[PDB]
Assembly symmetry: C3
Homo-oligomer: 114 residues x 3
């Protein structure tokens, strides 16, 4: 799985250990081993949510399977929780796009996961 | 809706008010309230278009519905217009990927839009 | 086509001529004219792959067609090869998301490709 967070929160406000926390919690949530989880945090961004620039985040979760209505509600609670607690971003200023990737459409290690 | 612009134009060349203008014009174009529009501009990027590092932009527009053939032509005229006028980017050096997202695949506020 | 590479490798480690090499090799691999190939490299990122901050890359290849099982295997061998040779990233620390875009969902030059 791959989780990306783009945010206007400054780098210095991203706590130590955050990428590891994301990795850990995503492995748990998706059921996939942490060796397969990749995470990417992009702070200091020029962004607005609903016309204003209070802390916000635009995020993506890509996974080969483990994507669906109930699962994605659960992921959203988890991820909005983490962004609120660690980055002080209000959950109503977070969007997360979920993508169910086909294995043949994910490259890794000179080939694909198919 | 979420609109992202990645560009090699420098930050200083992005006018004050550009995020607000995008918000307003996208609200009008999509018919969605401004409160639901998120915008993200990423200047100073290392990018090329057709092998050239002249000004260019790679963009994405995500929306739950309000995406389709005619609509995306209209959005492209609008947004290339804005990028030409405000950032001095030629329309033929802009790509915009359009995504019609399923509500269940968009997280927000600890749940999804489904 | 549009190819994006996000990496924790520093900017100074991205060799001169890299965006051109990508453009050229992607034109050849996809069969598309180089004029339609866009490339975007984002170094110095805060990211982890399998919990680790050793060099890694999270990438995307978008194309209108020319996406499929065998084609994507071949792209992955090409692209992982270039990331290894030029950026010294191990192929097993690269993910590449492949996207077959509908022409009606790609804006360019005030319109779409449909």
């Amino acid at each position: 799985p791959m989780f990306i967070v783009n945010t206007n929160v400054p780098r210095a406000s991203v706590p130590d250990g955050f990428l590891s926390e994301l990795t850990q919690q995503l492995a748990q949530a998706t059921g996939k081993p942490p060796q397969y989880i990749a995470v990417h945090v992009v702070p200091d961004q020029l962004m607005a949510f609903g016309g204003s620039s209070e802390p916000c985040a635009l995020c993506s979760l890509y996974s080969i399977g483990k994507i669906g209505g109930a699962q994605n509600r659960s992921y959203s609670k988890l991820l909005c929780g983490l962004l609120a607690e660690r980055l002080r971003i209000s959950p109503d200023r977070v969007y997360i796009n979920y993508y169910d990737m086909n294995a043949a459409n994910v490259g890794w290690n000179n080939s694909t996961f198919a």
